Amino acid sequence: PFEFVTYSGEESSPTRTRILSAALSPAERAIFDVPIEKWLSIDRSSLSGWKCAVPRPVTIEQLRPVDPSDAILRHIALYRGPVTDLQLDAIVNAANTRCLGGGGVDGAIHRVAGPLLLRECATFNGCQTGECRLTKGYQLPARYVLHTVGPVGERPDMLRKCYRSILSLALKNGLRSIGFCCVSTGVYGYPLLPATRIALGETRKFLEEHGGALDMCCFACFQEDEYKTYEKCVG
């Protein structure tokens, strides 16, 4: 009934051309051609080209909410592991401005999802800082990927704007569960604790104003320092 909103903002190309010129099998081409709106509910195993690349996905049912009693914290969990394990409606990819893969979480999301993720990214012209692109998740257990570009260094309005762009696209398109990674921390140099407070603060904001639209915001903390910082902040 609705066309998805796939970019939160308003609108090198040789590389994009080369990525898009690569041959596809007929089975891969059929996956790539599924309309973005249908991917959420399609039976992915009905497509002969598809498989899930994560042997034991983590489902909503397996996540421990921070506090079941609380109207907000029943919808938040922490996960000790990579965001790519999470079988949710979307996971967040901490991309760069080119939005064509890279190192760290960007690179691992591309490896698990398979080469169609890169190909879909090559159909649009990058992602501005503060904004979010939506793509299918291909071989990930999660249905979609929310590609966001965080700021370099400690720019709080810009980082807030990432979390807003992500949560706003999720609400508009009916994505009810989101797996977050730690945007702008590590090599982009946003200090970990202040970044974490922005992430949790914006998420709380959304959960207060839009209770019946979001079932679960999961914060995947692959590293120990990330996990302990989030753990201390939430309870």
Residue numbers in the entry: 11 to 21, 38 to 261
From the paper:
We show that the trypanosomatid MacroD1/MacroD2 homologues are hydrolyzing both protein-linked ADP-ribose and free O-acetyl-ADP-ribose. The macrodomain fold (starting from residues 99 and 92 in TbMDO and TcMDO, respectively) is well-conserved between the human MacroD proteins and consists of a central mostly parallel six-stranded β-sheet surrounded by five α-helices. Active site of the macrodomains is located at the C-terminal edge of the β-sheet and is lined by N-terminal ends of four α-helices.
Crystal structures of TbMDO were determined to 1.95 Å and 1.2 Å resolution (for crystal form 1 and 2, respectively) and crystal structure of TcMDO to 2.0 Å resolution. While the N-terminus of the TbMDO folds back to the core and extends the β-sheet, the N-terminus of the TcMDO packs to the precisely same site but in the neighboring molecule in the crystal.
